[PDB]
């Protein structure tokens, strides 16, 4: 399994969505541990043009904050949808402005687990 | 020409960008205000897939602490750059989920004036 | 007041939405003049994560033709609705790489009209 | 090794990013094969907003076409770059529109494969 730390990101992008109303436009909730141990969160933005996933949100949340490097983050979708595997999107932009970053997904086991983010995108550009 | 709350909105931003280290990949701030009265900042995320623009990273953070509807909206850039306008992708964002909302601009003699999102897009999508 | 080639552009737009079977992810086509007369053509392509409008897929195919410099464009939708004026991102995308060029839309008698793309972007970033 | 339908879709890629001039605008060419036999190229637009990748163009190119089914797909940068891995927000698209087509890339010993979409996004989204 995961890290204590780990596992209050999961804790806290779930109260983050799970504490705002029902929306079709803000349905993921996002949370990242930066490096010196702060936490930061955000929703999603839904929009055809590219609306920002959870993940991008939280980390403009965090360069905001100055928050530096991010090792860990997680998405959590409304209506106890749970750990929601990073986006291909996501994936490339934490690859390239987090490359130390891991992931937290669901494993065969339905079990939560951080994987470098590397790992989910193999052969990355 | 602007509220007392619209200055303000301006002061956020600039001071939210010229407190984090000068970067290629964080180099705007927004303000945001709510019609409860709440500001919400935030800073870009640059990335080529169209990693989402400080405004946006603002619709996600009012959004994470269910804000509602908001009001008006600023984009201060780094560089003591003052106000910018929001670029096209944000118009329509903001548009769309915010139509009521109002986005500081520069008018043709320099000065900072608050103006309806679709005087922003005319003939909009 | 449309010139021939513009109105052409209305044609060959309506002729591509309406030679592909109807589809949620492409939905609407779009067709730019080229400086050098040529005629190019494209079909949105759906997706969260930003996937391209149809004016975006002809910026793309012209440049893989060496096409230069368009000077006007034109979007049209399927399900018979006509023309669509460029979303936000399109014409902040339109304003960047081809400053010159126009945008068919519909004036209010909701006849087509050639508009330059500073004017649908008002004090444009 | 790579089929023969593969090493052309790597020389049509290839001889569309050299024919146009050297640009940072459209640097990347793309190609696809269809079903029904046919081939769609096209070159990325870059946009801060997120321009669409080369492939995200040809998608459009060929939806444009009535294509319907993409079997493989390779992305060439300019300048003698070569195969490209697809960026993270193209491997969610064309997983998402085109799940059973196949990318060619580099695999450990810099020697291209086509590989399957699926395997690009472990645990996708
Ligand atoms: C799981 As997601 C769509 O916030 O990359
Ligand atoms: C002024 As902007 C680049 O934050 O839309
Ligand atoms: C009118 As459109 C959605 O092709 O910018
Ligand atoms: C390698 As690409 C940036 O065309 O996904
Ligand atoms: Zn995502
Ligand atoms: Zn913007
Ligand atoms: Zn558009
Ligand atoms: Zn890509």
Same mark, same amino acid.
């Given at each position: 399994?995961?890290?204590?730390?780990?596992?209050?990101?999961?804790?806290?992008?779930?109260?983050?969505?799970?504490?705002?109303?029902?929306?079709?436009? #803000?349905?993921?909730?996002?949370?990242?541990?930066?490096?010196? @141990?702060?936490?930061?969160?955000?929703?999603?933005? #839904?929009?055809?043009?590219?609306?920002?996933?959870?993940?991008?949100?939280?980390?403009?949340?965090?360069?905001?904050?100055?928050?530096?490097?991010?090792?860990?983050?997680?998405?959590? @979708?409304?209506?106890?949808?749970?750990?929601?595997?990073?986006?291909?999107?996501?994936?490339?932009?934490?690859?390239?402005?987090?490359?130390?970053?891991?992931?937290?997904?669901?494993?065969?086991?339905?079990?939560?687990?951080?994987?470098?983010?590397?790992?989910?995108?193999?052969?990355? #550009?």
């Amino acid at each position: 399994p995961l890290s204590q730390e780990e596992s209050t990101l999961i804790e806290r992008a779930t109260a983050t969505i799970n504490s705002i109303p029902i929306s079709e436009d #803000y349905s993921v909730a996002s949370a990242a541990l930066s490096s010196d @141990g702060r936490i930061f969160t955000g929703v999603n933005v #839904y929009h055809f043009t590219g609306g920002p996933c959870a993940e991008l949100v939280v980390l403009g949340t965090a360069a905001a904050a100055a928050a530096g490097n991010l090792t860990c983050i997680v998405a959590i @979708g409304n209506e106890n949808r749970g750990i929601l595997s990073p986006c291909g999107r996501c994936r490339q932009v934490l690859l390239d402005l987090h490359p130390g970053i891991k992931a937290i997904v669901k494993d065969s086991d339905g079990q939560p687990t951080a994987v470098g983010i590397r790992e989910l995108l193999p052969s990355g #550009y």
